[PDB]
Every structure is written in structure tokens, then in C-alpha cells.
Amino acid sequence: RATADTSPERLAAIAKDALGALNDVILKHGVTYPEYRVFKQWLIDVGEGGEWPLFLDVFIEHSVEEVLARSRKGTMGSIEGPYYIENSPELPSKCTLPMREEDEKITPLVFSGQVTDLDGNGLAGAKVELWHADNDGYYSQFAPHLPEWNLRGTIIADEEGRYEITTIQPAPYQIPTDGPTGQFIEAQNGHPWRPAHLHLIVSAPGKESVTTQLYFKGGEWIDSDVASATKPELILDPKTGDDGKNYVTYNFVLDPA
Amino acid sequence: RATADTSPERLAAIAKDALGALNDVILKHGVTYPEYRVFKQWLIDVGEGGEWPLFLDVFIEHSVEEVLARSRKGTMGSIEGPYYIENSPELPSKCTLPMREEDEKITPLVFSGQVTDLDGNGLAGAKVELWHADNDGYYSQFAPHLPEWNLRGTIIADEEGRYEITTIQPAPYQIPTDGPTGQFIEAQNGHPWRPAHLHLIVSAPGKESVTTQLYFKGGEWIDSDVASATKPELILDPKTGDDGKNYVTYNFVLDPA
Ligand SMILES: Oc1ccc(Cl)cc1O
Numbered sequence: 001r002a003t004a005d006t007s008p009e010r011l012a013a014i015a016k017d018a019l020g021a022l023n024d025v026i027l028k029h030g031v032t033y034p035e036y037r038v039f040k041q042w043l044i045d046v047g048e049g050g051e052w053p054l055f056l057d058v059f060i061e062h063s064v065e066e067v068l069a070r071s072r073k074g075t076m077g078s079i080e081g082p083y084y085i086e087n088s089p090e091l092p093s094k095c096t097l098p099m100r101e102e103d104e105k106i107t108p109l110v111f112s113g114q115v116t117d118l119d120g121n122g123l124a125g126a127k128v129e130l131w132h133a134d135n136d137g138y139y140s141q142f143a144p145h146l147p148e149w150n151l152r153g154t155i156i157a158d159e160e161g162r163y164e165i166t167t168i169q170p171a172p173y174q175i176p177t178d179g180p181t182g183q184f185i186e187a188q189n190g191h192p193w194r195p196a197h198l199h200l201i202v203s204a205p206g207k208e209s210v211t212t213q214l215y216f217k218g219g220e221w222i223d224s225d226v227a228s229a230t231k232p233e234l235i236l237d238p239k240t241g242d243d244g245k246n247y248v249t250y251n252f253v254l255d256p257a
Numbered sequence: 258r259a260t261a262d263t264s265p266e267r268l269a270a271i272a273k274d275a276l277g278a279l280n281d282v283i284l285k286h287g288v289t290y291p292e293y294r295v296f297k298q299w300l301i302d303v304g305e306g307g308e309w310p311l312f313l314d315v316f317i318e319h320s321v322e323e324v325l326a327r328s329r330k331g332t333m334g335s336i337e338g339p340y341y342i343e344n345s346p347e348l349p350s351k352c353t354l355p356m357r358e359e360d361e362k363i364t365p366l367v368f369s370g371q372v373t374d375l376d377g378n379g380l381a382g383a384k385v386e387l388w389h390a391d392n393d394g395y396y397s398q399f400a401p402h403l404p405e406w407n408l409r410g411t412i413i414a415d416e417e418g419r420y421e422i423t424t425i426q427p428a429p430y431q432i433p434t435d436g437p438t439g440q441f442i443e444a445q446n447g448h449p450w451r452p453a454h455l456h457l458i459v460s461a462p463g464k465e466s467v468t469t470q471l472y473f474k475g476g477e478w479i480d481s482d483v484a485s486a487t488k489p490e491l492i493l494d495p496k497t498g499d500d501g502k503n504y505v506t507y508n509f510v511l512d513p514a
């Protein structure tokens with residue numbers, strides 16, 4: 001039951017700008033009646049396909065985080081995306097993310113670092129909620145065949161704010177091509193792809209949490225993210241060990257609540 | 258199964274402008290995350306309530322007709338609205354619109370005029386599709402209690418392009434306040450009202466049809482139409498007879514197909 005405290009005055013100004021802007025694009029490009037019928041049917045399709053969270057997060061949410069970005073001094077944020085789930089099972093500072101026997105076959109990714117405040121003091125009782133896709137680009141709880149907490153966890157950072165999280169390296173994400181979001185994209189010759197990414201919500205007692213994503217230097221779609229959610233500050237350059245595992249360190253800087 | 262011949266190049270440019278514009282409004286007004294969740298839930302509600310045609314026609318379609326307005330030299334057009342139905346039963350040049358025993362109690366409106374071309378030559382085989390709401394502001398086929406062609410007809414203009422159509426005078430229209438469209442309006446202190454109006458599609462053999470609406474001089478909401486669909490060229494000034502009926506004449510000027 002979602003709410004916001006927006007005064008009628010504010011909404012009216014937003015509505016005026018949003019609707020005026022759309023209406024101007026129509027006048028600009030000479031949007032015809034047949035094209036208008038196509039837009040109306042496609043908005044119906046979007047909701048009938050359950051793709052409002054998907055369409056909105058891909059095309060709109062980057063600007064919402066960009067707003068929040070201004071008011072923030074810590075680690076760069078990025079969009080949540082639609083694939084977040086609360087209360088993923090807790091795990092200790094040093095852990096391995098829950099995975100299938102399939103996932104065990106993929107080159108491992110060892111993610112290390114520390115949660116700290118703005119001055120660099122480590123934070124006790126910090127939490128790292130991590131979620132990402134498997135090598136097949138699917139999310140648990142958004143794929144029937146997967147264990148419901150595959151590659152999802154609540155990492156409990158130690159008394160010093162540190163974690164050593166062993167996972168696999170995520171595959172790039174492709175947005176279902178079959179639906180209206182993918183229809184919108186195929187019809188303009190765009191591409192339905194996101195670079196490979198880790199999702200992280202990072203919290204601490206008395207701190208303003210951070211929702212962020214982490215990408216990979218080599219990675220494809222790196223310079224053409226369809227959700228426009230990539231920032232260079234969030235690109236990891238993992239180095240590979242003689243065990244053949246990929247090793248990366250990244251620290252989280254939380255703002256005060 | 259609705260389609261348009263829009264090249265990927267065009268859609269991409271439209272998409273770029275539409276999405277950029279929205280994204281700018283977000284950056285402009287500092288659209289927060291809670292407000293974003295409210296917008297996402299409301300887009301889901303709109304489609305779940307079957308109010309995409311309603312929301313679009315009220316807030317977007319005026320600009321689509323404004324485009325078509327440029328390419329046209331005949332009678333001013335206006336939006337279709339969501340309440341149009343094809344194949345309304347035919348009636349002769351001089352007729353009375355189908356109505357209930359209730360409607361017979363309302364002051365009658367006698368609508369007369371002629372369908373002509375750009376030079377003022379009358380057009381044989383011209384059709385006047387007329388639809389409007391009853392004094393209770395409901396449309397037939399969008400209200401269970403009404404006969405399915407209440408205040409809907411296909412008037413067959415005579416060999417000379419003339420019609421004398423007796424109906425009642427429509428009541429102002431109020432957009433359902435209970436749904437997401439009305440929620441969007443109540444939440445900004447807007448008003449959910451349209452001035453009283455007749456709907457007309459006017460066609461002739463070899464002519465580009467006209468979808469238009471006709472309003473009434475005294476009428477309330479006349480200068481504040483929520484669908485922004487009012488034009489001064491479409492305001493009727495009916496004069497009343499000694500039978501106590503309201504009499505108005507209006508001619509349709511069709512463009513060539
Ligand atoms: O995996 C994802 C797919 C689409 C979006 Cl918008 C965000 C994601 O995080």
C-alpha cells in the first residue's frame with residue numbers, strides 16, 4: 001500500500017510538465033492517429049504482461065536515482081531494478097552465496113571490502129544485501145527452476161565492517177524480447193541487454209542505506225546499458241588468482257541517516 | 258490488431274524525446290523514490306481498471322488531433338473520446354435519435370445543417386454518425402441500464418447533404434472519480450468534468466471524414482475542459498422555439514480524400 005507526501009501543488013506542476021512534454025513530442029514529430037492507436041494498445045499490453053516495473057526501471061529509474069545522487073556523498077548509487085527481494089537469508093562476513101551445482105562450475109568471484117562512513121571509520125553491524133543473475137542470466141524467484149534464494153543473501157559484515165563474499169561472476173542481462181518492453185526495443189533497432197552486474201543494498205545502524213550496482217571492466221554492453229544505470233565509479237577490475245578465482249575489493253561509503 | 262507504418266528511425270527519435278522529457282521532469286522537480294513507487298503503482302492501477310483509453314483520450318489525444326488539424330481545411334475537428342461505437346443503426350435525413358421514455362422529458366434539441374465540400378457544394382450520400390450522453394451523463398454500451406444505441410445513430414444526409422436531427426441536449430460529462438484517472442485529478446485539486454457535447458463523425462463519398470465535437474454557448478466547464486478538446490469554432494448557440502425546443506444549425510465542411 002504505497003504512498004508519498006506530495007502536495008496537490010507539486011503533483012499539478014509535475015503533471016503539467018509531464019503531460020505538456022509528451023504533448024509537445026506529439027506536435028513535434030507529427031504523431032498520427034494510427035501511431036496513437038499503436039501507443040494505446042502497447043500501454044494496455046505492458047500492464048497485461050506485468051511489465052510496468054520492468055519498463056519503468058529500465059527507462060525511468062536512472063533519473064530517480066540521479067536525483068538522490070545529488071543529496072549523497074557516499075558510494076555512487078544505481079537503480080534497484082525489478083529483481084530485489086527483501087529478507088534474503090543471512091550469512092556471515094566470510095561466506096559463499098547460495099548456489100546450485102551448476103553455479104559451482106563457473107569461475108568464482110571473491111568479493112571483499114569494508115563498509116565505512118564518510119571519514120573512513122569502519123561500521124559495525126553493517127549489512128550487505130547482494131543479489132544477481134546466474135550464468136544463464138536468470139534471477140531466483142523470477143525463474144521457476146531456481147532455488148528461491150539462489151545468488152541472494154544478507155551478508156553480516158563483522159565488528160569491523162568487513163566481508164569476504166564468494167559468488168560467481170554474473171552474466172549480462174537480456175530483457176525478455178517477447179513482451180512489450182522488448183517490442184518497444186526491437187521496433188527501434190535497440191538492443192535488449194544490460195552489462196553483467198551485482199546488485200547491492202548496503203546498510204549500517206544510523207546510516208542512510210545505498211542501493212547500487214557493480215559492473216566489470218572487460219564486460220560487454222558496458223558502454224550501452226539499456227537501463228542507463230552504469231557509472232564508471234562502479235566498474236570492478238577483478239584480478240585472477242592462482243586458484244584461478246577472480247578477486248576484487250570494493251568499499252562502501254555510507255551517508256548518515 | 259492495430260498497426261502503423263513507423264520506421265525504427267522515427268520511433269527511436271520519438272522514444273528519445275518522450276523518455277528524455279519525462280526524465281527531465283524528474284530531474285527538474287526532484288522526483289523522490291517514494292513518489293516513484295506511487296507512479297509505478299498508479300500505472301498498474303490504470304491498466305487494471307481498464308482506463309488506458311480514458312486517460313489517454315482525456316490527456317493526450319488533443320495533441321494528436323492538433324497534428325491532424327494542420328493538414329485540414331474543413332470543419333474543425335476534436336478528439337474522438339473513448340465512447341465511440343461503429344455501426345450505429347441508420348436513420349433518415351430528418352429523424353429523431355433513439356431514446357428512452359426518460360429522455361423524452363428533456364428539452365429537445367433540433368440539429369440541422371448540411372454536409373458540403375470546401376467550395377460549398379452540397380454532398381450526396383453523406384453520413385452523420387452522432388453519439389452523446391444522456392441527461393445523467395452516461396453513454397449507451399458503457400452503462401448496463403441503457404438500450405445499446407441510446408443517443409447513437411447513423412444519419413443518412415439527403416441527396417443535397419441536409420439533415421434535421423432531433424435529440425436531447427447532452428449533460429456535462431464527469432470522468433469516474435473512483436478510478437486512477439480521477440485519483441490523478443483529485444490528488445491535484447483538478448476537476449473531473451467535461452462541458453456538455455455532441456460527438457460527430459461526418460463522412461462523404463470521396464471525402465476525408467471528420468471526427469469532431471460540438472459544445473453549447475451557456476455551458477459550464479466550457480472554458481475548462483479536462484480533455485482540452487474545446488474549440489470556439491465548435492460552440493453552438495441554440496435558439497429556442499415557441500414549441501419550447503432548442504434549434505441550431507451547423508454545417509460540415511469535408512476535405513477531399
Ligand atoms: O537485472 C535487471 C534487469 C533490468 C533492470 Cl531495469 C534492472 C536490473 O537489475
Ligand SMILES: Oc1ccc(Cl)cc1O
Pocket residue numbers: 311314315316337338339340430432451456484
Ligand atoms: O465523453 C467523453 C469523456 C472523456 C473523453 Cl477524453 C472524451 C469524451 O467524449
Ligand SMILES: [Fe+3]
Pocket residue numbers: 081083173197199
Ligand atoms: Fe539486475
Ligand SMILES: [Fe+3]
Pocket residue numbers: 338340430454456
Ligand atoms: Fe463524450
